[PDB]
PDB file of C-alpha atoms in Angstrom:
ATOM      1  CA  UNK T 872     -16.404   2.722  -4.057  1.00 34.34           C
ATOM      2  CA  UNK T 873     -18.228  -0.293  -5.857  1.00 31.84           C
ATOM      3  CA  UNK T 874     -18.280  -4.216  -5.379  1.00 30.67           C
ATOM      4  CA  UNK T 875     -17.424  -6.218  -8.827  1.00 26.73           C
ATOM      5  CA  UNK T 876     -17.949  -9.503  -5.839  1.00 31.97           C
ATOM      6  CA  UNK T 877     -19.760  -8.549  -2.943  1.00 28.91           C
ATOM      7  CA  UNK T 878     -17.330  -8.186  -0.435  1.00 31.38           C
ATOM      8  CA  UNK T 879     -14.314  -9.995  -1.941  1.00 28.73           C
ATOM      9  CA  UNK T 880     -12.811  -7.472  -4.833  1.00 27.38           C
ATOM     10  CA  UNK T 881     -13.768  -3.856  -5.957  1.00 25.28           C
ATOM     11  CA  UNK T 882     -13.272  -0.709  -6.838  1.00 22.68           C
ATOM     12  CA  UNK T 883     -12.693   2.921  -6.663  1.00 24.29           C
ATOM     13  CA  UNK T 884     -10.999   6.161  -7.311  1.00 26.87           C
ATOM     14  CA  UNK T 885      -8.554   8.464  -4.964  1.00 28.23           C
ATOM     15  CA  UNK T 886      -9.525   9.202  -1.432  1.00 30.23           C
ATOM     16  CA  UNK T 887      -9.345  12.616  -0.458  1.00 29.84           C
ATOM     17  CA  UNK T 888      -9.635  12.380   3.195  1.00 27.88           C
ATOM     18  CA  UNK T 889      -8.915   9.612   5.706  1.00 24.78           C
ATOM     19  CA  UNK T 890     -12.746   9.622   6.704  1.00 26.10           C
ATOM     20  CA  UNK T 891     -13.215   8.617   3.397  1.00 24.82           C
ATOM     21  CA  UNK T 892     -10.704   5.809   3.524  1.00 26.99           C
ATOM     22  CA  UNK T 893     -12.728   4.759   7.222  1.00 25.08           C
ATOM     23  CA  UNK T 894     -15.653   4.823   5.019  1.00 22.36           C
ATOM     24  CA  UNK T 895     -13.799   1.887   3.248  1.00 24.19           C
ATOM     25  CA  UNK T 896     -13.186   0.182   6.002  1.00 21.32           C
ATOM     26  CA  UNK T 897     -16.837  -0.220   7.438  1.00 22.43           C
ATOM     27  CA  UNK T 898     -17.478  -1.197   3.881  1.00 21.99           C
ATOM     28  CA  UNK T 899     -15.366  -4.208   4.190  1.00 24.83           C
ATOM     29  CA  UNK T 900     -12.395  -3.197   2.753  1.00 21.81           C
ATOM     30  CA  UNK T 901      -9.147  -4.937   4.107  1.00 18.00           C
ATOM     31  CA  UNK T 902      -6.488  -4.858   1.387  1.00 17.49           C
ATOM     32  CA  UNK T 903      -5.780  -1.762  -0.963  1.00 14.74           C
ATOM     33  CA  UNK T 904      -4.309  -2.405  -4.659  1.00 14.03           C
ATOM     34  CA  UNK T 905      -2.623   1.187  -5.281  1.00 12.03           C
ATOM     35  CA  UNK T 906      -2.775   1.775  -8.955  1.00 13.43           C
ATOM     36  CA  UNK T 907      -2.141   5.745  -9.471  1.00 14.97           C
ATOM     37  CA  UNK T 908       1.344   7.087  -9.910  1.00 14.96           C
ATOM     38  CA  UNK T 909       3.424   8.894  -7.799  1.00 13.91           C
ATOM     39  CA  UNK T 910       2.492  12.376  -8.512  1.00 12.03           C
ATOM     40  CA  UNK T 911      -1.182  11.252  -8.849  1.00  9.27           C
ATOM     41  CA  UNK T 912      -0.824   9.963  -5.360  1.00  9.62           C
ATOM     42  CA  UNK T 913       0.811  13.812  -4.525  1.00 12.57           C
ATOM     43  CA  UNK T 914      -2.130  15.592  -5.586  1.00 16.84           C
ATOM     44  CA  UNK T 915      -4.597  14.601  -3.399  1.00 15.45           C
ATOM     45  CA  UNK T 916      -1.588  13.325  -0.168  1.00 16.01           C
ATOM     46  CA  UNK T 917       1.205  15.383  -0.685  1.00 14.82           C
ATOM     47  CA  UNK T 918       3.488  12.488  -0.734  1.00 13.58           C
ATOM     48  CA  UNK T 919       3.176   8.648  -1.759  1.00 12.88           C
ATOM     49  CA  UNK T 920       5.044   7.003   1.322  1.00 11.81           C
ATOM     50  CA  UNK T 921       2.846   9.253   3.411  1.00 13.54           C
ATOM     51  CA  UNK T 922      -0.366   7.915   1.754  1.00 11.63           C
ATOM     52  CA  UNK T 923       0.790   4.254   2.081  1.00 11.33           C
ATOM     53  CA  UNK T 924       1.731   4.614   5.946  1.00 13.53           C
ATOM     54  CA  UNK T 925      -1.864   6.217   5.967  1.00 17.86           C
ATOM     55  CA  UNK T 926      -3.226   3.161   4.514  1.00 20.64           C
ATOM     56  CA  UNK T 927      -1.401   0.725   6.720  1.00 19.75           C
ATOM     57  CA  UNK T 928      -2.267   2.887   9.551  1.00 18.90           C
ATOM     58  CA  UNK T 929      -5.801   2.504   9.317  1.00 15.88           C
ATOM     59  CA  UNK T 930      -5.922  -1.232   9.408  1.00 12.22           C
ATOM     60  CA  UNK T 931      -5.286  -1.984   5.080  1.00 12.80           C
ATOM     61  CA  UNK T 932      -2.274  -3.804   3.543  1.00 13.45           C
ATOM     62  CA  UNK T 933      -1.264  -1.342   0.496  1.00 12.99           C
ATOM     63  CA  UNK T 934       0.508  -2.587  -2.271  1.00 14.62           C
ATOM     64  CA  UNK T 935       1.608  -0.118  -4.850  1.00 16.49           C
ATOM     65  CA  UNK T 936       1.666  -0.746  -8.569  1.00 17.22           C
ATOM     66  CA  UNK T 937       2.243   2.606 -10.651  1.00 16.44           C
ATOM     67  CA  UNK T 938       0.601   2.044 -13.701  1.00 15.24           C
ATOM     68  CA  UNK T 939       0.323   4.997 -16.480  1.00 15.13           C
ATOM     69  CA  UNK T 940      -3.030   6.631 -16.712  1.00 12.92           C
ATOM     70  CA  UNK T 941      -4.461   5.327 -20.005  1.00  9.73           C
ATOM     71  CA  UNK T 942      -2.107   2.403 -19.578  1.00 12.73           C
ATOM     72  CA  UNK T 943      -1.987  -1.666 -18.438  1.00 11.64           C
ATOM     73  CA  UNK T 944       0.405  -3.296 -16.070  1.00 13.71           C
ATOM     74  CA  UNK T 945       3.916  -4.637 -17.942  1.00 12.12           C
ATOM     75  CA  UNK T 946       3.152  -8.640 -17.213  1.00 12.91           C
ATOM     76  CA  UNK T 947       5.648  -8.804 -14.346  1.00 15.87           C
ATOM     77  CA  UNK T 948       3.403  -6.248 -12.904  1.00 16.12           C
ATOM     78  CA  UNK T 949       0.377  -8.202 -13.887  1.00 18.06           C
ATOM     79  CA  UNK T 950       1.794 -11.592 -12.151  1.00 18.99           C
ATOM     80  CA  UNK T 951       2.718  -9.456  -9.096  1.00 18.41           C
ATOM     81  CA  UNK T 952      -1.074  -7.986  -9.002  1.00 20.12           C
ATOM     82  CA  UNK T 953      -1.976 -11.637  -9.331  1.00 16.86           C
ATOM     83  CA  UNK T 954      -0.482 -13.231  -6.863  1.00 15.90           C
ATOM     84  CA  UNK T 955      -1.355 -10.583  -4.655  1.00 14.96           C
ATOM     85  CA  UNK T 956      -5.207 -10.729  -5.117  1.00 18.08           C
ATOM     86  CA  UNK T 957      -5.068 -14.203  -5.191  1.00 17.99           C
ATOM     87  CA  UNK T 958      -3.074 -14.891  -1.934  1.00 18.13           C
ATOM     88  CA  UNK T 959      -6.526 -13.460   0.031  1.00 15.36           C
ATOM     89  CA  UNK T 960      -9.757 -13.223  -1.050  1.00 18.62           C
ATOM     90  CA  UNK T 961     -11.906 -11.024   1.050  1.00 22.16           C
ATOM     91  CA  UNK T 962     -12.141  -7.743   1.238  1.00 21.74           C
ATOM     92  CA  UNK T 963      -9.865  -6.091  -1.538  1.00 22.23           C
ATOM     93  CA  UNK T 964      -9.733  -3.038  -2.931  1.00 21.24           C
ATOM     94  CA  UNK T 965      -8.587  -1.791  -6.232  1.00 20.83           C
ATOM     95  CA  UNK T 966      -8.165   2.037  -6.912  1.00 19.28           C
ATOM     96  CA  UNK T 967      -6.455   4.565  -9.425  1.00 18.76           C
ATOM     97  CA  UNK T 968      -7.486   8.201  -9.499  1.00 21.84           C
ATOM     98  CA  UNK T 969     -10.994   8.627 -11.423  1.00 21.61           C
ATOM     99  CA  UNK T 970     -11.740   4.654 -10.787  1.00 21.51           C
ATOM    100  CA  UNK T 971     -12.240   3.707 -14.479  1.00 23.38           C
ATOM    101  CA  UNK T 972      -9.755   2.622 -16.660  1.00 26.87           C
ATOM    102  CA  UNK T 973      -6.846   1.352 -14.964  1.00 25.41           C
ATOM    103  CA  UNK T 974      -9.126  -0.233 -12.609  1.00 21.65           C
ATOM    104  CA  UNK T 975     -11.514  -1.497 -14.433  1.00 15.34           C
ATOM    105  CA  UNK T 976      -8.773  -3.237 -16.310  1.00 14.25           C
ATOM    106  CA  UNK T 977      -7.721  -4.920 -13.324  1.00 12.45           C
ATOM    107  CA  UNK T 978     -11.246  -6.078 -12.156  1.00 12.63           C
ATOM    108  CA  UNK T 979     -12.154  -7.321 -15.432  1.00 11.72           C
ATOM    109  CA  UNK T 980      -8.468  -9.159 -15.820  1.00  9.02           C
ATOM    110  CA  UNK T 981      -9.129 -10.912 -12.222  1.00  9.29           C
ATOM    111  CA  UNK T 982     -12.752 -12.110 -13.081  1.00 11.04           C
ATOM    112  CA  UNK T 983     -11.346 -13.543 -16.411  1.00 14.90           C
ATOM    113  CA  UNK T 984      -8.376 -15.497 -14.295  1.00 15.01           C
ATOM    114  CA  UNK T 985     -10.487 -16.374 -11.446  1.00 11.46           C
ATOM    115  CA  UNK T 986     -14.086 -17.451 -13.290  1.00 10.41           C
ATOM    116  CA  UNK T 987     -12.755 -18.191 -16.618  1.00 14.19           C
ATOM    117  CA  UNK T 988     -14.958 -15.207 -18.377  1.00 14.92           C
ATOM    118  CA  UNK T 989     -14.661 -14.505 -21.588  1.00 15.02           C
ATOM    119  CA  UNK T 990     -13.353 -11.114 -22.303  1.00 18.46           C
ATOM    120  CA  UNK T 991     -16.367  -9.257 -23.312  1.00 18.08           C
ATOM    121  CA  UNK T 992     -18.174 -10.678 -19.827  1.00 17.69           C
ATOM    122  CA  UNK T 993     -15.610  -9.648 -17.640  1.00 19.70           C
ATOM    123  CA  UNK T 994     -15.713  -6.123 -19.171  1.00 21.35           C
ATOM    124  CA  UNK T 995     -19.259  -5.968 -19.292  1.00 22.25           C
ATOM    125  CA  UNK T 996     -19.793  -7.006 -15.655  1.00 23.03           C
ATOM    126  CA  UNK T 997     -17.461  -3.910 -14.276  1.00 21.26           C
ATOM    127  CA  UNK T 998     -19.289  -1.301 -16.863  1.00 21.56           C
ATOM    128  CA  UNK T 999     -22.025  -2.470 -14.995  1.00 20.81           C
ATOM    129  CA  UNK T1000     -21.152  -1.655 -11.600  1.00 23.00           C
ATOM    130  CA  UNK T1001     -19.066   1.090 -12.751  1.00 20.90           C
ATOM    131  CA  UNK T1002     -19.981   2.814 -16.258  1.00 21.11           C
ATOM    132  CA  UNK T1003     -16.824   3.141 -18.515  1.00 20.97           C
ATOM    133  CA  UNK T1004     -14.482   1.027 -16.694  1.00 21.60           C
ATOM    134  CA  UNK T1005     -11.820   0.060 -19.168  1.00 18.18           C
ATOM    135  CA  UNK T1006     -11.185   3.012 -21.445  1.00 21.97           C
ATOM    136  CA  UNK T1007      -8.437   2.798 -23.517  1.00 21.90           C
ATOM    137  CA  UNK T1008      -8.150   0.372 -27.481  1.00 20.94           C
ATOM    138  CA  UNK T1009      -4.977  -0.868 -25.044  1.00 20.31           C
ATOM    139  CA  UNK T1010      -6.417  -1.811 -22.407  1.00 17.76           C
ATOM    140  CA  UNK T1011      -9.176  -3.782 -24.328  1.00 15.40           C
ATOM    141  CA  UNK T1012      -6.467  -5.616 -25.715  1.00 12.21           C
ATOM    142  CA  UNK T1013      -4.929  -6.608 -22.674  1.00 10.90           C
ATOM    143  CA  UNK T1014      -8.230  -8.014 -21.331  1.00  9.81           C
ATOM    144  CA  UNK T1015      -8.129 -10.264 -24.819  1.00  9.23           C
ATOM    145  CA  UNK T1016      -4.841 -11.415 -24.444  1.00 11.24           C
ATOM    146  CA  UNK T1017      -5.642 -12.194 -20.664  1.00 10.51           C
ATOM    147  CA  UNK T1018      -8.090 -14.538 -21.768  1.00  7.61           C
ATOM    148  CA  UNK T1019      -6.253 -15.859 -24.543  1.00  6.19           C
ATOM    149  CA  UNK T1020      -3.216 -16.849 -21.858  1.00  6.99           C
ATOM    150  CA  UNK T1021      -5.158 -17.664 -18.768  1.00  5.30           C
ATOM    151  CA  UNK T1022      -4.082 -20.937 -18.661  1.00  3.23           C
ATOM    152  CA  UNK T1023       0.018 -19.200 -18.628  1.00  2.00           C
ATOM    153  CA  UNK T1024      -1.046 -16.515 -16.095  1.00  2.00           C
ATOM    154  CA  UNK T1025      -1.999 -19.332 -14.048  1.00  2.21           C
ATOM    155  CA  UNK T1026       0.567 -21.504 -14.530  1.00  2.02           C
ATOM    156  CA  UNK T1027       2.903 -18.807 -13.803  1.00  3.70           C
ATOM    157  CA  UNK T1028       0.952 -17.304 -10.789  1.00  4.35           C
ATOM    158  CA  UNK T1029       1.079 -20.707  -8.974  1.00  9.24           C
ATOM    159  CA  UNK T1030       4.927 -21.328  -9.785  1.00  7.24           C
ATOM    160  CA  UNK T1031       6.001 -22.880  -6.300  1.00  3.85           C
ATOM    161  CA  UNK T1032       8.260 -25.613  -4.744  1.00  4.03           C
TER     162      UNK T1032
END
């Protein structure tokens, strides 16, 4: 598990054993971002509902958002994401299976929202906590067009009464 902000959003890959979720939680984890798919999920808990209750058991508000190995969220996925990182800042966790890609993507999307980075900054600062965060040509061009419609993003994060 790594820290992109000390304390407030990171990452990681798939726990294979509760201690290693406790492990987590006396790092300062309080919120988990669940990235994987199901049947990523499976390998390592059997079954996804069992590894969410697990979650929630153990004192961290899961919130699951399948995204394709290799892949990027669809942009209601993204918003969703968003709005949940946003709503509280310490302590949040985001994990797929290896901890790289999908992941990284995330991190590097938040940092671009949240500190107005450009693209290649946000990416750089995760490959530096975390070598070879963001893998895929697809996922780089996410990050660009995250940057590109930050100003949308946040319009449309923030949509209230």
């Amino acid at each position: 598990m790594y820290w992109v902000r000390r304390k407030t959003i990171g990452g990681s890959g798939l726990p294979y054993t509760e201690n290693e979720i406790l492990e987590w939680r006396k790092e300062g984890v309080k919120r988990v971002l669940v990235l994987p798919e199901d049947w990523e999920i499976e390998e390592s808990w059997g079954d996804k509902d069992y590894y969410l209750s697990i979650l929630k058991k153990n004192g961290l508000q899961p919130l699951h958002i399948p995204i394709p190995d290799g892949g990027v969220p669809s942009d209601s996925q993204f918003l969703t994401i968003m709005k949940w990182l946003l709503s509280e800042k310490e302590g949040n966790l985001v994990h797929c299976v290896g901890g790289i890609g999908r992941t990284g993507t995330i991190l590097a999307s938040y940092l671009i929202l949240t500190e107005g980075l450009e693209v290649e900054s946000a990416i750089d600062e995760v490959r530096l906590v975390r070598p070879g965060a963001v893998q895929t040509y697809e996922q780089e061009m996410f990050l660009l067009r995250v940057e590109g419609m930050r100003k949308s993003w946040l319009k449309n994060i923030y949509s209230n009464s």
